Amino acid sequence: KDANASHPSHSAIQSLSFHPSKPLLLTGGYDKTLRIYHIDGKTNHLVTSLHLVGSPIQTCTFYTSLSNQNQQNIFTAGRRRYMHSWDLSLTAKIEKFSRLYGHESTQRSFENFKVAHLQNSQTNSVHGIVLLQGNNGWINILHSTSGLWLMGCKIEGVITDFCIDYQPISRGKFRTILIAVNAYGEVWEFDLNKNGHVIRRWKDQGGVGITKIQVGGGTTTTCPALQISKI
Amino acid sequence: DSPVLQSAYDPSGQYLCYVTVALDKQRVGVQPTQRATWNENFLYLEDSKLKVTCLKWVNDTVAIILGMNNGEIWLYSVLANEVTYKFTTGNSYEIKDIDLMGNQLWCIDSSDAFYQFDLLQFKLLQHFRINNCVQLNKLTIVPAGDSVAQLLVASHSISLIDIEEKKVVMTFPGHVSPVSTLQVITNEFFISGAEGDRFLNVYDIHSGMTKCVLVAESDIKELSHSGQADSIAVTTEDGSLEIFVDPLVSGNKSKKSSKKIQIVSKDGRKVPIYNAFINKDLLNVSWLQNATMPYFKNLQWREIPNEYTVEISLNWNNKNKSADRDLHG
Amino acid sequence: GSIKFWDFQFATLNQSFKAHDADVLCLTTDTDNNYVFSAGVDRKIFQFSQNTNKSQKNNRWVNSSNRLLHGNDIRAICAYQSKGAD
Amino acid sequence: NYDTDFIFLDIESTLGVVGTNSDIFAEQLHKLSS
Amino acid sequence: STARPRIITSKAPLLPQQTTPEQRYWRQYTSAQLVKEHNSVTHISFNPQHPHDFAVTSSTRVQIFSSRTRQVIKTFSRFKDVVYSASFRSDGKLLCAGDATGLVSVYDSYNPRTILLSINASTHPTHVTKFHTQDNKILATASDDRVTRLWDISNAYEPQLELTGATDYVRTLSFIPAAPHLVATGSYDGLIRLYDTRSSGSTPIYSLNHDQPVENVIAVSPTQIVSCGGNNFKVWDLTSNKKLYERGNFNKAVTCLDYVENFDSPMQSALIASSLDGHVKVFDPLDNFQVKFGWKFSGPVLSCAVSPSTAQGNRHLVAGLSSGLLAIRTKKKKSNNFQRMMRGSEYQGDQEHIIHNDKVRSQRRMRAFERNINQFKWSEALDNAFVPGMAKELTLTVLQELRKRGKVRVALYGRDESTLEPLLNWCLKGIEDVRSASIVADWVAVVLELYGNTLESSPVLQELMIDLKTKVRHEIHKSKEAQRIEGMLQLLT
Amino acid sequence: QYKLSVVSGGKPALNNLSSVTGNKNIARLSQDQRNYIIPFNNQIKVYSVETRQCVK
Amino acid sequence: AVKDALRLVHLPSCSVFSNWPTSGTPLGKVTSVAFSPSGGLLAVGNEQGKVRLWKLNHY
Amino acid sequence: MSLWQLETNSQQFLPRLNGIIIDCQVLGPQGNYYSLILQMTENNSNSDYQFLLLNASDLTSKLS
RNA sequence: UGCGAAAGCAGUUGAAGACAAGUGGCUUGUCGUUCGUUAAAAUGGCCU
């Protein structure tokens, strides 16, 4: 059965994400509402539904932390200078991120974000980062709970898309790599568990107008790991 | 249609066990019917096509027996979260109904076979099958103490069965469709109700004669009877509840419902009741508030009016009033 | 007014500082590149330091200091550093 | 105050006034589901 | 943390003769039109129903003007003598005009060529003709025959009722607005008679003694009516036969009245009065018929009217003068593919459970002095004060904000001759006013405290200080003589 | 028939020591950081950060 | 950009599945897509406002 | 209350906090709260402190 | 500082010790020092 058949959408469905554990599907579009559906085979019903006024949404993501796997945030954002974060509690407590901590000129719209995990690498403490794709070549990485700007990674060209790769190192330590593509086809990989420094820079063979990069086969941002040893 | 595939109360109506699908796999959860005395962990069926066909509360480590569709009765403790023991028949046939009396579990098969298991010994005691009963989908033990004589089996047509002779001793005219509820009321009566009809009938288990017919005003999903036959509450297809008060007295051959309860929200949206529970003066109704999470309500059903409309508070357009901010933002 | 440090191989930015209020006309460094001094039309001289062992092992300049000494501009800056002259 | 009491304010600001089976299953489930 | 409080504009204690809401509303009736008629405009009526046209009765023609272009849409010129009264029926469908030969002629409105019927009333001139306001098929015409007549417009041969009884020159009718059997007529002997039409009709049920010869009688409530004649107007409770207000706020005789109800206004009701000396005034019936606004015109005003209660468009006040001209003052009032792509932007959360709202409201734009006081640019805030296009209260409030807030001296430190001349050249103008002169005093005192050497060097602010000295000399003569007047009426207590 | 009582709270009363900069805030968060334990000069107030009410 | 433009390419073999989607799959103008982490289950949202749902029976 | 990004020396402000900050500290495990003591020194006759934590996300006064 | 009214009316401004600079003393100046008396400045300014 069509998942949003129970409660129709009033716009084109711009983003779509499953929950990492629960049977929930979050849809959202330019009608500035976001809907969660308990999906099954027969009767995909609507769990809850939140209409953010004056804020059409373009990307919406279930985030679930690695430490306790008990937060269940929803980060959502559109063509705005803010990004909402709903804390799932089954009223609804949402917060708004609207401060680039000195970096507002290079981030004029919170549309293209991605959420990922990051490790402190002196403690074994992970925390979520949101990653915002900005104007020049910039990716502004900031904390997913405090909203503090952690670091920024600039590629040379027109930034078009990016993805997050993880690689394990030892027992309980992994490393986060940001993979960002020019429009022209040249790809930067930034190690960002340290300071956001480039470790590899390669070039796509062929390809001249590049719109979308993705990784897969392990833990992406859309197949997320529930436990840190499962990365 | 309802996401809750199977659901049943424990005796005394204190917990509700319910099987719902969760993104192509069945999951079995238990909720307390009153919090004043969430439970966020489920039993997960790990196969995409294994599913629960029946479930029964045992009575004292508390457990559920879940009759599956691969010839197995799983026995699952609820305080812990594992199937403690896996009864199996020799076959792969789905099992249509189970019951237990004391420690003696009985079950029916899709090949119309009867199996008996012992919960104290974890063993298949008996396996048999009887003639002219060929589409069985309900059994009910007629209670006679620790003796577990006289099963009562339905196939659209109820048949009383002596198990020492493995033979049929009475034959009741059932329905025109498969029987969906078949429950013993007193030591001389049993109620039965079929799939897709709104007529229960109470039969006399000693003669075969139908005492009375009970008429819901919508197709009956589940029923509960209070433990002393004085009240029967059925829940129907349109999400309503109908209480027949004292149905076993002299509205002479067929009785209508005495009380009818439905739930609406503050808006006008009618939520459906599934699977209520009744006892002496106390009635506990269940619905789903969000998509699959059950909410309950206790009611003194003897002092409510006849046409009762429960009102619940449910989010429809409410402005998200954050506690850290006044109304002016 | 921004001062940027770029990794030569990979040809890409490591970190950008928003230091001056107008143009940065001239900037220079010392011998072992523990400091970078910079100046322009907003007439302050900024000093960017990497002298800490953690700064050298992490490749992280910090915006250390800032002095106002000139009257109108700074169009030229240079550095000399020897055994009896720095 | 206008209902026959007198409030006073201390110098460290304390306002004062001069006036006129199933049970163990329930317990262990509320433990194990919290 | 809070938001920043806005800079509050310095308001002084209010002076007398402030702008009332009534006179603000009645003062936005502007853009006067003067249309020269052939003779004195005697009557003017409005269309009731689509209340958007008005008929002006000049001599020997009646012109319907539109209430959106103010030009003559239609005109009625086939009268033999001077046409006197012209009113629309309550349905606004046809137009009656009494003529100086005693020939009431009723046309249909918006068609001057179809004269519908010509009632031949008295041989005397018929001076007032109006339909019933409740009934549709009866027309009341009074004439210089000292007898009014009610005519059924089906049987237009004999009058269906003949209201006599008045001794001299009946010039006005009126109907009572809830009881349709009740006709109040007014004549040049005073004595508003009024008649129950179910009775004989040759005797009034009672009579109201306006002492002057009345010029008009209108009905305000179903109970109270207002008669104007002579220098005053009086109001009369009709259930108790008794006068209860009289306003005589004119010099010459009040020629006409009319009344408005429920229209979009601070005034819930309004009676305006036109009075042969140039004045038309508006009186508010809810606070005891007190006058709230007035217009003065270029000659003796003979008749006036306003747009009716349901005007819904361009709203008019018209006054026709005895000089032979007409004065109108009005108050006025991408792709289907792209839209399918950008569909949802007008939804606003109807079927949605929770609806979150944290879009902050966009406040008024900050002026340059306010954002400079915010950015702590205090000398730039003083510079932004003394631009030419600044309001006087705005210059005063940024001076007062720099005075209270920080330092006059900080705002005045880096200055010289060319950058002090705006301040002192404004202080010349601000020293005259009472509300500014304390701030002007301490600002001039501080600037001569810390620029006493530039006084010596530059001669072209020496003369500014001398002009300021003569200004304070004039102002101190004024502030001394005000204390003398204060004493000389303290003597008279 | 008249009786005196102290019924309403007072000042929060942090560490009133000299020579301690930084940590003079003796209020604590819980470990399951849902309620905030602040002392007063008359009592220990325990507020709840979810609902902003004093709960104990 | 166009209607029904969705392909599922099998890999490591790098070969597009040739039996789905067909000409009668109501994919629409595919403006989002999502995979379930456990069930083997596609959600495909189009410009009409419809999430269509499919289950891959390998999982 | 300013918070200095020590990489680029970049301040983020919170400007009108009805009292001078006599103590400020991060509080959470991830640092999601700031706790502050505000001395409110317009009256010189008493030392009256306001205790104000606030969530670090949108810098709103959670539990003053 | 005290009494006052928002005006005003009476009172002032010592000592010890340590340290710093200058030329063990002498001079000058300070004090997260004590006793007694009712007693201007580090280019450094306010969020989305």
Side-chain angles (χ1 to χ4, degrees), chain A, chain B, chain C, chain D residues 1-20 26, chain E, chain F, chain G, chain H:
Chain A
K1 175 140 168 287
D2 293 357
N4 74 315
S6 175
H7 198 146
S9 186
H10 286 73
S11 68
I13 285 175
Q14 299 292 327
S15 189
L16 196 58
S17 49
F18 279 98
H19 203 274
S21 63
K22 293 146 177 34
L24 270 45
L25 176 87
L26 170 75
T27 88
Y30 279 152
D31 62 332
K32 65 199 80 65
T33 175
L34 71 165
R35 304 175 174 86
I36 313 173
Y37 293 90
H38 180 282
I39 73 140
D40 48 352
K42 306 297 171 305
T43 55
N44 309 119
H45 269 110
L46 178 132
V47 174
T48 173
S49 173
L50 167 78
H51 177 93
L52 312 155
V53 306
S55 164
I57 72 171
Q58 157 76 53
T59 316
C60 46
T61 321
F62 274 119
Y63 166 78
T64 317
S65 79
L66 271 178
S67 71
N68 43 356
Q69 54 263 45
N70 276 130
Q71 265 84 14
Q72 288 89 20
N73 284 123
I74 289 182
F75 293 90
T76 177
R79 198 171 272 195
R80 288 300 184 273
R81 279 186 293 273
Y82 49 89
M83 157 179 44
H84 285 292
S85 177
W86 178 6
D87 180 28
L88 284 178
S89 50
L90 273 301
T91 174
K93 37 177 301 177
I94 84 165
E95 309 92 5
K96 183 201 279 193
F97 297 158
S98 43
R99 291 97 190 273
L100 287 311
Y101 279 65
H103 301 257
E104 286 104 344
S105 68
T106 182
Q107 180 74 211
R108 301 307 307 191
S109 157
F110 279 60
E111 280 171 345
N112 306 94
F113 75 99
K114 280 187 181 174
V115 194
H117 301 297
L118 191 64
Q119 191 138 36
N120 180 35
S121 71
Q122 65 263 12
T123 51
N124 293 14
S125 50
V126 296
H127 56 87
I129 45 175
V130 309
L131 287 87
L132 301 167
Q133 165 200 323
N135 48 12
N136 206 274
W138 280 99
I139 309 290
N140 295 305
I141 305 155
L142 60 93
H143 211 276
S144 89
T145 78
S146 39
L148 296 171
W149 184 90
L150 296 173
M151 75 203 92
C153 317
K154 176 185 216 303
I155 82 159
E156 270 321 297
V158 194
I159 174 71
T160 43
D161 211 271
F162 64 100
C163 80
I164 317 293
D165 195 11
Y166 310 86
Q167 56 174 48
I169 285 303
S170 73
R171 181 180 321 271
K173 287 164 182 308
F174 64 100
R175 151 202 298 194
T176 316
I177 295 100
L178 164 69
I179 295 171
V181 194
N182 204 346
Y184 167 60
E186 42 210 9
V187 184
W188 284 250
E189 291 184 352
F190 308 91
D191 200 1
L192 68 152
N193 75 325
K194 57 191 62 177
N195 297 289
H197 279 155
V198 194
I199 55 184
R200 203 202 165 191
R201 187 173 150 167
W202 52 279
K203 168 65 169 72
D204 168 46
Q205 172 188 92
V208 55
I210 297 299
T211 64
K212 207 74 55 172
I213 202 180
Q214 196 51 72
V215 282
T219 68
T220 73
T221 80
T222 319
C223 167
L226 294 91
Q227 187 207 338
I228 169 162
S229 44
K230 308 276 273 162
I231 274 167
Chain B
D1 203 71
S2 176
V4 173
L5 289 194
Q6 302 274 333
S7 80
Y9 281 85
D10 73 315
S12 65
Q14 210 180 349
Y15 308 102
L16 179 72
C17 165
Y18 70 111
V19 179
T20 77
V21 198
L23 188 131
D24 85 4
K25 292 174 200 283
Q26 302 282 99
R27 58 168 185 202
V28 191
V30 168
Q31 292 304 298
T33 71
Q34 164 53 263
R35 189 61 168 193
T37 56
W38 204 252
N39 178 30
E40 316 93 352
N41 43 359
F42 301 91
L43 169 65
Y44 268 103
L45 298 203
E46 72 270 60
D47 188 17
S48 174
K49 68 196 203 82
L50 177 67
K51 51 187 66 174
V52 180
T53 78
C54 69
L55 63 98
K56 181 73 56 186
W57 280 81
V58 312
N59 290 111
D60 276 326
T61 294
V62 59
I64 323 295
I65 38 175
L66 311 158
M68 301 286 176
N69 61 336
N70 56 340
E72 289 181 356
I73 295 99
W74 290 18
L75 200 148
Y76 151 74
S77 157
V78 292
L79 272 305
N81 257 336
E82 67 286 348
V83 45
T84 82
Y85 185 71
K86 212 150 298 185
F87 292 100
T88 174
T89 75
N91 296 318
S92 74
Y93 295 129
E94 76 156 58
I95 59 158
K96 304 272 182 194
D97 201 6
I98 66 192
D99 208 323
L100 52 78
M101 175 57 63
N103 75 306
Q104 200 160 310
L105 156 69
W106 278 87
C107 87
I108 207 70
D109 215 9
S110 73
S111 73
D112 319 306
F114 291 72
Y115 299 83
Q116 184 196 341
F117 301 94
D118 213 350
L119 296 202
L120 203 63
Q121 302 304 117
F122 307 96
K123 292 191 303 172
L124 197 150
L125 259 50
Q126 283 177 339
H127 156 261
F128 58 95
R129 63 186 57 162
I130 319 177
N131 283 329
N132 40 291
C133 42
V134 287
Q135 282 107 14
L136 316 172
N137 50 358
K138 291 294 171 184
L139 64 85
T140 295
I141 295 167
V142 188
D146 291 31
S147 41
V148 196
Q150 279 190 320
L151 298 171
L152 187 67
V153 192
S155 72
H156 71 61
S157 176
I158 311 109
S159 76
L160 186 51
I161 284 171
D162 187 40
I163 58 155
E164 277 96 314
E165 304 275 274
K166 305 178 186 195
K167 80 161 197 164
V168 167
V169 296
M170 262 175 243
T171 289
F172 304 88
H175 309 259
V176 310
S177 56
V179 183
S180 64
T181 61
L182 174 72
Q183 289 187 1
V184 170
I185 297 302
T186 71
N187 53 359
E188 74 256 4
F189 288 128
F190 67 98
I191 196 80
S192 71
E195 267 168 4
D197 79 313
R198 62 187 195 275
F199 282 71
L200 305 156
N201 47 7
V202 46
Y203 302 89
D204 177 89
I205 204 162
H206 281 139
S207 71
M209 287 271 313
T210 80
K211 181 190 188 60
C212 183
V213 183
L214 281 307
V215 183
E217 57 188 54
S218 199
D219 309 66
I220 280 151
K221 279 306 169 184
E222 318 266 341
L223 75 94
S224 196
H225 51 95
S226 42
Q228 54 269 11
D230 61 333
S231 182
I232 286 169
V234 311
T235 170
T236 74
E237 185 143 54
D238 56 343
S240 275
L241 192 77
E242 278 138 19
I243 310 178
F244 311 96
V245 191
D246 203 2
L248 268 60
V249 300
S250 64
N252 43 1
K253 281 185 280 194
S254 88
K255 303 206 170 53
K256 324 296 180 303
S257 70
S258 317
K259 301 190 181 302
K260 161 157 151 60
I261 303 155
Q262 78 263 20
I263 307 184
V264 305
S265 87
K266 303 298 214 67
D267 318 333
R269 290 194 268 129
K270 174 167 174 305
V271 304
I273 304 183
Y274 76 104
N275 199 13
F277 175 86
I278 207 169
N279 208 0
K280 54 186 75 63
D281 313 331
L282 175 80
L283 161 77
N284 176 81
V285 299
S286 171
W287 66 98
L288 303 161
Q289 190 80 271
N290 292 117
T292 65
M293 46 159 51
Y295 277 44
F296 306 95
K297 183 82 167 310
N298 275 132
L299 289 180
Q300 300 311 118
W301 63 267
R302 283 208 210 259
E303 58 186 1
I304 64 155
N306 292 143
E307 310 98 313
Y308 192 38
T309 305
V310 167
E311 281 264 356
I312 58 174
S313 43
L314 186 42
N315 308 147
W316 176 234
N317 261 344
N318 40 6
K319 319 284 159 282
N320 195 10
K321 176 61 180 307
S322 69
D324 295 25
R325 181 152 298 237
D326 80 316
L327 284 79
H328 290 224
Chain C
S2 73
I3 292 163
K4 292 145 170 311
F5 297 91
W6 317 76
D7 199 13
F8 191 91
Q9 69 152 353
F10 309 129
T12 178
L13 184 140
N14 293 351
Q15 53 190 351
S16 173
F17 298 91
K18 190 175 288 208
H20 297 70
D21 283 28
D23 318 351
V24 187
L25 296 180
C26 52
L27 48 88
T28 189
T29 179
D30 65 321
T31 322
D32 271 330
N33 303 285
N34 297 334
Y35 307 96
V36 164
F37 299 90
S38 76
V41 52
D42 78 312
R43 89 200 214 199
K44 282 194 283 184
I45 298 187
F46 276 73
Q47 164 201 49
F48 293 82
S49 89
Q50 211 191 60
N51 44 27
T52 297
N53 201 294
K54 207 189 72 169
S55 294
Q56 287 196 4
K57 80 153 170 287
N58 290 165
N59 207 328
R60 300 305 279 179
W61 305 87
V62 307
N63 183 11
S64 170
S65 294
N66 179 20
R67 286 192 99 166
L68 181 57
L69 301 171
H70 285 255
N72 204 295
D73 272 10
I74 295 101
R75 298 214 173 189
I77 198 170
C78 71
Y80 190 64
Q81 197 178 6
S82 275
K83 195 164 266 287
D86 56 349
Chain D
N1 50 296
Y2 295 80
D3 44 358
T4 50
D5 315 281
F6 322 121
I7 318 156
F8 55 90
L9 174 64
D10 177 21
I11 205 179
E12 308 149 332
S13 310
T14 81
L15 299 157
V17 69
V18 282
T20 61
Chain E
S1 178
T2 84
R4 206 198 265 103
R6 305 283 276 196
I7 294 308
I8 297 180
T9 288
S10 72
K11 198 180 292 185
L14 82 159
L15 263 43
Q17 296 314 111
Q18 77 263 4
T19 81
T20 60
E22 294 101 24
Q23 90 190 7
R24 178 191 318 269
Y25 170 68
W26 284 110
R27 93 183 180 195
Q28 58 178 340
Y29 277 71
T30 174
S31 49
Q33 273 199 1
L34 287 310
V35 190
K36 181 69 178 57
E37 294 294 318
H38 295 164
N39 208 314
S40 58
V41 171
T42 72
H43 285 263
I44 171 167
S45 175
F46 264 86
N47 211 18
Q49 269 313 302
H50 202 213
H52 73 315
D53 297 322
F54 55 98
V56 171
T57 308
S58 157
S59 87
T60 182
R61 62 170 180 163
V62 179
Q63 299 146 287
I64 298 175
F65 294 78
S66 88
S67 72
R68 56 185 68 245
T69 78
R70 307 191 275 178
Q71 272 76 247
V72 176
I73 46 168
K74 279 191 186 297
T75 172
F76 295 76
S77 64
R78 51 183 300 175
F79 299 96
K80 287 215 168 304
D81 209 292
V82 168
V83 55
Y84 274 122
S85 197
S87 69
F88 294 91
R89 204 168 79 163
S90 60
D91 62 352
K93 266 177 203 156
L94 67 167
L95 177 142
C96 76
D99 166 68
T101 60
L103 190 133
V104 189
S105 78
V106 46
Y107 304 78
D108 62 329
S109 42
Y110 319 121
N111 210 330
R113 290 322 204 280
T114 80
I115 164 164
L116 218 56
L117 55 99
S118 82
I119 280 158
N120 204 30
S122 53
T123 43
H124 284 94
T126 286
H127 267 270
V128 43
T129 42
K130 37 178 66 175
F131 293 93
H132 211 98
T133 44
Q134 282 84 29
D135 203 319
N136 274 280
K137 36 187 297 173
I138 46 177
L139 166 62
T141 84
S143 40
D144 289 357
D145 203 2
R146 317 182 330 247
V147 48
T148 87
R149 291 161 187 90
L150 310 182
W151 303 81
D152 198 290
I153 50 173
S154 321
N155 297 272
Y157 319 107
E158 57 102 21
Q160 90 162 4
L161 196 50
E162 209 156 357
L163 264 48
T164 180
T167 61
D168 170 46
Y169 272 10
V170 178
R171 286 293 165 86
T172 320
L173 280 309
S174 191
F175 297 97
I176 309 302
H181 58 104
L182 217 48
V183 176
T185 200
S187 47
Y188 277 179
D189 60 335
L191 269 295
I192 297 98
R193 284 105 181 154
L194 59 156
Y195 300 85
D196 195 8
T197 49
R198 277 93 42 93
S199 69
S200 83
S202 315
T203 55
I205 44 176
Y206 36 87
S207 314
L208 297 170
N209 186 22
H210 197 124
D211 193 27
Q212 279 96 343
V214 311
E215 304 266 346
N216 256 294
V217 44
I218 68 158
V220 168
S221 277
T223 64
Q224 67 190 20
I225 66 162
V226 182
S227 92
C228 83
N231 59 334
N232 45 50
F233 66 92
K234 303 160 180 168
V235 320
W236 312 85
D237 194 292
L238 212 73
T239 60
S240 69
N241 213 358
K242 184 177 150 303
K243 192 185 80 75
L244 70 157
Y245 294 111
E246 170 200 322
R247 301 279 102 91
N249 307 143
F250 311 94
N251 277 331
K252 301 179 179 187
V254 195
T255 46
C256 85
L257 305 168
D258 82 313
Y259 170 72
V260 214
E261 178 71 29
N262 274 326
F263 71 123
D264 284 324
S265 175
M267 228 184 281
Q268 214 270 344
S269 319
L271 184 135
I272 78 169
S274 174
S275 84
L276 255 193
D277 57 340
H279 276 117
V280 54
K281 302 186 185 295
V282 50
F283 296 78
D284 184 12
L286 275 307
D287 51 345
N288 310 122
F289 283 78
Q290 283 311 297
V291 58
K292 293 304 195 296
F293 193 78
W295 295 266
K296 178 84 175 185
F297 284 115
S298 62
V301 194
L302 216 65
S303 82
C304 82
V306 289
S307 295
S309 180
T310 58
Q312 94 185 13
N314 219 342
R315 206 173 266 280
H316 286 55
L317 182 140
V318 194
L321 314 188
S322 174
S323 174
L325 55 95
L326 204 163
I328 308 160
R329 315 184 75 87
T330 80
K331 74 167 290 192
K332 304 181 284 179
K333 302 208 77 158
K334 316 180 65 195
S335 312
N336 287 11
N337 291 358
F338 179 74
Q339 285 170 44
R340 206 158 47 235
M341 187 175 75
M342 307 272 120
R343 195 151 80 253
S345 158
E346 50 97 28
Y347 177 51
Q348 304 158 12
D350 273 328
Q351 280 72 233
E352 267 58 23
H353 290 190
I354 313 169
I355 296 155
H356 190 80
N357 194 341
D358 44 2
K359 300 288 287 267
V360 75
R361 277 211 185 279
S362 65
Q363 42 188 356
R364 200 194 39 87
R365 187 208 274 100
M366 266 181 297
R367 295 173 175 268
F369 74 95
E370 179 158 11
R371 70 172 184 87
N372 284 293
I373 287 177
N374 286 2
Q375 294 282 333
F376 316 105
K377 323 285 199 46
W378 291 358
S379 63
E380 284 96 308
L382 202 56
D383 279 352
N384 284 280
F386 300 130
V387 312
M390 194 62 60
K392 305 207 174 64
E393 60 266 68
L394 291 193
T395 46
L396 182 69
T397 190
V398 55
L399 282 187
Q400 288 202 327
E401 278 286 340
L402 289 176
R403 170 181 167 275
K404 146 192 74 182
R405 175 166 314 263
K407 208 188 209 212
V408 187
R409 325 199 180 273
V410 159
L412 287 172
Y413 268 156
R415 309 302 176 92
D416 43 357
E417 192 270 320
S418 86
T419 70
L420 278 180
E421 193 265 319
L423 183 133
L424 281 306
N425 219 27
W426 185 86
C427 278
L428 298 196
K429 278 86 189 172
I431 204 53
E432 300 154 343
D433 199 285
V434 174
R435 312 164 266 219
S436 46
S438 176
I439 312 297
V440 176
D442 69 81
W443 273 82
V444 174
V446 166
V447 66
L448 58 88
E449 180 208 318
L450 90 164
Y451 287 97
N453 219 56
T454 310
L455 289 186
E456 173 273 349
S457 71
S458 157
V460 304
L461 51 83
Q462 298 184 151
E463 56 90 19
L464 206 46
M465 295 305 243
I466 295 166
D467 215 346
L468 194 37
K469 173 65 183 174
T470 73
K471 285 293 186 190
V472 190
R473 195 48 78 197
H474 293 346
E475 296 293 286
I476 203 174
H477 159 60
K478 291 218 287 193
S479 202
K480 275 190 297 196
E481 73 166 355
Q483 185 61 73
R484 308 212 206 102
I485 310 291
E486 205 270 348
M488 91 192 274
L489 97 168
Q490 186 76 20
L491 163 67
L492 260 50
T493 293
Chain F
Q1 67 268 12
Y2 276 71
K3 42 195 69 53
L4 177 135
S5 300
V6 285
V7 294
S8 294
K11 45 174 66 188
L14 73 155
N15 277 326
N16 263 7
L17 293 95
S18 190
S19 82
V20 179
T21 195
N23 40 12
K24 36 177 62 76
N25 182 18
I26 45 188
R28 299 284 294 192
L29 259 180
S30 318
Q31 49 276 20
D32 164 77
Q33 38 175 46
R34 285 172 53 190
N35 39 6
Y36 190 69
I37 302 161
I38 173 179
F40 270 55
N41 65 334
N42 320 333
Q43 77 267 29
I44 294 276
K45 293 271 271 292
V46 178
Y47 287 81
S48 157
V49 291
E50 312 315 318
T51 78
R52 299 184 58 143
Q53 306 303 305
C54 195
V55 296
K56 189 56 189 313
Chain G
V2 310
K3 265 202 199 312
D4 299 328
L6 183 134
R7 306 283 179 259
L8 303 203
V9 41
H10 176 270
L11 44 86
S13 93
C14 303
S15 59
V16 161
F17 286 115
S18 69
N19 75 314
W20 195 83
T22 71
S23 52
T25 52
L27 283 176
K29 189 183 284 286
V30 183
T31 174
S32 180
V33 74
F35 264 118
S36 157
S38 165
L41 196 148
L42 273 172
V44 171
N46 44 29
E47 203 195 14
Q48 317 198 48
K50 292 156 194 322
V51 168
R52 266 76 193 253
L53 204 82
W54 283 274
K55 174 176 169 60
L56 288 95
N57 288 315
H58 186 69
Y59 307 95
Chain H
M1 174 197 70
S2 94
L3 64 157
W4 301 76
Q5 178 171 298
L6 258 56
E7 314 288 335
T8 59
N9 313 63
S10 186
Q11 305 96 20
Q12 181 72 220
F13 294 118
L14 195 65
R16 274 93 63 188
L17 284 182
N18 49 58
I20 60 172
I21 296 97
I22 64 159
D23 172 41
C24 59
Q25 54 161 348
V26 297
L27 212 58
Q30 300 304 321
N32 43 0
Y33 300 113
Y34 308 137
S35 43
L36 265 59
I37 309 180
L38 303 163
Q39 216 262 333
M40 212 173 323
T41 175
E42 50 255 52
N43 61 327
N44 41 2
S45 90
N46 201 7
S47 71
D48 35 5
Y49 312 89
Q50 168 150 353
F51 278 50
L52 185 145
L53 77 159
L54 70 159
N55 65 324
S57 58
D58 53 13
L59 264 73
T60 48
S61 77
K62 180 168 308 300
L63 192 72
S64 159

